Design an enzyme around this catalytic site. Sequence first.
Site, PDB file in Angstrom:
ATOM      1  CG  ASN A  40      -5.211   6.199  -2.132  1.00  0.00           C
ATOM      2  OD1 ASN A  40      -5.582   6.085  -3.303  1.00  0.00           O
ATOM      3  ND2 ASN A  40      -5.576   5.352  -1.181  1.00  0.00           N
ATOM      4  NE  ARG A  46     -37.878   8.895  18.422  1.00  0.00           N
ATOM      5  CZ  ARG A  46     -37.688   9.691  19.466  1.00  0.00           C
ATOM      6  NH1 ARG A  46     -38.527   9.631  20.494  1.00  0.00           N
ATOM      7  NH2 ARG A  46     -36.670  10.540  19.480  1.00  0.00           N
ATOM      8  NE  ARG A  47     -39.451  10.297  16.652  1.00  0.00           N
ATOM      9  CZ  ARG A  47     -39.484  10.789  17.881  1.00  0.00           C
ATOM     10  NH1 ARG A  47     -39.297  12.090  18.073  1.00  0.00           N
ATOM     11  NH2 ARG A  47     -39.714  10.000  18.910  1.00  0.00           N
ATOM     12  CD1 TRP A  84      -3.231   1.072   0.442  1.00  0.00           C
ATOM     13  CD2 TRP A  84      -1.898   2.505   1.527  1.00  0.00           C
ATOM     14  NE1 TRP A  84      -3.873   2.280   0.517  1.00  0.00           N
ATOM     15  CE2 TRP A  84      -3.073   3.172   1.176  1.00  0.00           C
ATOM     16  CE3 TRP A  84      -0.918   3.205   2.224  1.00  0.00           C
ATOM     17  CZ2 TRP A  84      -3.285   4.498   1.482  1.00  0.00           C
ATOM     18  CZ3 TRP A  84      -1.147   4.520   2.544  1.00  0.00           C
ATOM     19  CH2 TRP A  84      -2.311   5.153   2.174  1.00  0.00           C
ATOM     20  N   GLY A 121       9.395  -2.642  18.251  1.00  0.00           N
ATOM     21  CA  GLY A 121       9.780  -2.693  19.629  1.00  0.00           C
ATOM     22  C   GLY A 121      10.474  -1.455  20.136  1.00  0.00           C
ATOM     23  CE1 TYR A 173      -4.500   1.783  16.402  1.00  0.00           C
ATOM     24  CE2 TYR A 173      -4.939  -0.343  15.415  1.00  0.00           C
ATOM     25  CZ  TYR A 173      -4.360   0.903  15.354  1.00  0.00           C
ATOM     26  OH  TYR A 173      -3.637   1.239  14.230  1.00  0.00           O
TER      27      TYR A 173
END
Lengths: 161, 157, 85, 88, 85, 84
Positions: B36, B72-73, B28, B95, B135
Amino acid sequence: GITAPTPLTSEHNLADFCCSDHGMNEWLKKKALKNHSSGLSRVYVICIANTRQVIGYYCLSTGSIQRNLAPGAMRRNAPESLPVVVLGRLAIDQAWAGKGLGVALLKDAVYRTMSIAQQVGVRALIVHALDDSVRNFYLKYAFVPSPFQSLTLLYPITLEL
Amino acid sequence: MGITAPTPLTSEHNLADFCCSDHGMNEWLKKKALKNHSSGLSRVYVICIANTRQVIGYYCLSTGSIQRNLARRNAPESLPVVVLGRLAIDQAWAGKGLGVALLKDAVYRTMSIAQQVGVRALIVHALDDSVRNFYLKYAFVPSPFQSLTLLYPITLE
Amino acid sequence: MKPESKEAPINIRAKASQRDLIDMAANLVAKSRTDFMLDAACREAQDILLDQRLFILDDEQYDAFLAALDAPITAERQAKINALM
Amino acid sequence: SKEAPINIRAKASQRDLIDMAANLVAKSRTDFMLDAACREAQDILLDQRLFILDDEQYDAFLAALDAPITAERQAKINALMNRKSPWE
Amino acid sequence: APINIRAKASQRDLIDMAANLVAKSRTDFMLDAACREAQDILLDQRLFILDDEQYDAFLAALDAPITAERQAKINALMNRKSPWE
Amino acid sequence: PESKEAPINIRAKASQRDLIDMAANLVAKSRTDFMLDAACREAQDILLDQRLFILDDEQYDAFLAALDAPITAERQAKINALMN
């Protein structure tokens, strides 16, 4: 009045441009600068006297035509390519038509391709024509139809290595 | 013998050396990172050897949205969010703590953005169970909509 | 992601000017027309909902969002951001 | 061009996705998806760069490049290159 | 774990040609491509359409007070002093 | 319409098709059609490597020059002069 076509930048006011074909219209509006900057196709523009409102653009990206290594069951075909250049979109502001501007871009498009075909070995300027209006314009300015598919015209370039 | 601050990707930075553990994030960088980042889709950041353009680590941010289904709505309701696409550190420099070091930069930059525009969480997709542990260890919490998706909620007022 | 999905229909009136153009491209990428028109509509749907125009209400918020995004988070801008929260 | 419907067996999530998008741009589901399809379809055909052809076709192409320029073709090249562009 | 695909020829001959130009088997290549796309699809995923139960659960995730547990992790993230710092 | 269909069989692991199915499922594709689009668009990209014809960084400079340079009566007739 107008000056030479040059690469697109964020500075060209691209907003007020209407060319009658929404696909080509939305493309400059949406995909032109992000495309041209990320390097896939390269996009050129022409402007009012010194205004940087844009009246005509065209994009042309490299491309390649290749011999199928296996026309069937991996037969006597070796890796054989040919550099070539696709002219994707040529479009001109719907209200500067008639003013002879489309050919003027196509002519710059061809010179450029001929300019690069010296350095790199490109061989034709392909283009894909979807209208009969568009196809009959490209045929009128020397693009021969391609043998390998019908939408696709090309303008062969032949010189020396 | 030193390492530089993260800084947006430039055509100069050598990316050909960098080889982290995951083939995905090696390809990538060397294949889609400047394609990108130059087309303003995502935004790539890199840390180099003290004075090189040798990239050792990188991460990428990009805007995202989390939206309220209309079916809900149902009135259209979006929250802007930032997605920490990829974080990756060159094996030979693993590390040394640069992994956290970048994630801290991400959060800092993301709370900075979230002061400008209304960004409401940083968001990462832990694929590996080791990734998820990293994470979780640094204050991300599992989202309630995807298992593999974690949130760092950033509710500046 | 993990779970599989449960369908819903979309019927739409199609001219032939378009339906032949959509079908040419669909065959050039070895999709079906449904498949083509579906991945065409969602790719654009996604890119509409993801407009930064939907949280950046300015051309000036847009300069702060581009600036803070690219500024290095130096010791000062860590104090600033921490001292602003 | 005539109006013969296209039936789409969409997954409910994607149908949901298209509707919210449509709403942002004042289009019906039909008019959004068919505009979008149309648009990408034309780009797909207009930005096509890789042609993997077979032997009869690749020679038939090599033929096309190994050609003397016919009298008509040269006379069109003439029309193109004689026209002086308004920036010239 | 068998993965058996029934492709086109306008497809496999395209797949075979690039495979034979990177020195990879046709097998090791469609997988390396599918893996790498499966990954980057999943990793670079930015639009979420949640229903009302999940969206509010997301809302509850943002309004939730910071537990001592989670705060101490933040501190660990914040106090660490990167080697460019 | 749908052309001549002939197969490709592979073996893989769970570390792969679990991943390859998450994406396939996320974008509402079948693993079959996920990996075809996946491969075919990676094939298209490397068969289109500009390195395959540009061929060094001597010609890479002179290529983007012919690319972005403008076409004046000066350049036009001089590229017209080398054509001749």
